[PDB]
């Protein structure tokens, strides 16, 4: 009786998806917030 091993796709996704989401949030906020004119 064998058992399925832990999916490497899920293992690397655990570190990928939050990392991509954080990078996207950083780029989005940085490029959009400091956009208005100043005196």
């Amino acid at each position: 009786k064998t058992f399925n091993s832990v999916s490497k796709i899920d293992r690397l996704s655990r570190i990928a998806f939050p990392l991509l989401f954080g990078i996207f949030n950083l780029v989005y906020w940085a490029t959009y917030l400091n956009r208005e004119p100043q005196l």
Partner: nanobody
Amino acid sequence: GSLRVSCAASGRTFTTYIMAWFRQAPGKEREFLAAMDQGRIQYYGDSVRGRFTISRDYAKNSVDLQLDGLRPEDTAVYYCAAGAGFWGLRTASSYHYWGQGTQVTVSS
């Protein structure tokens, strides 16, 4: 002498934006000449009030400036800009779009 300089936009409709003209002489900062608003409303700088005339053709999306009564120290490169006037309508910093500039020289 008299002259007419046209400025045609492309890639973006500026019918709702404010279209203005600026001047840059050698060794001076950018000076506001004239501006036209969405409501066909005209603003002019004091140094060039009563001489220059600004017009906007919304159909072909362009702003024209008619220069009359030129005097020799008006030689400069003229820039065309379009944008919404925030903190501005007279300051260059309020415009995001600018032309490459056209040189104008007056000979005595």
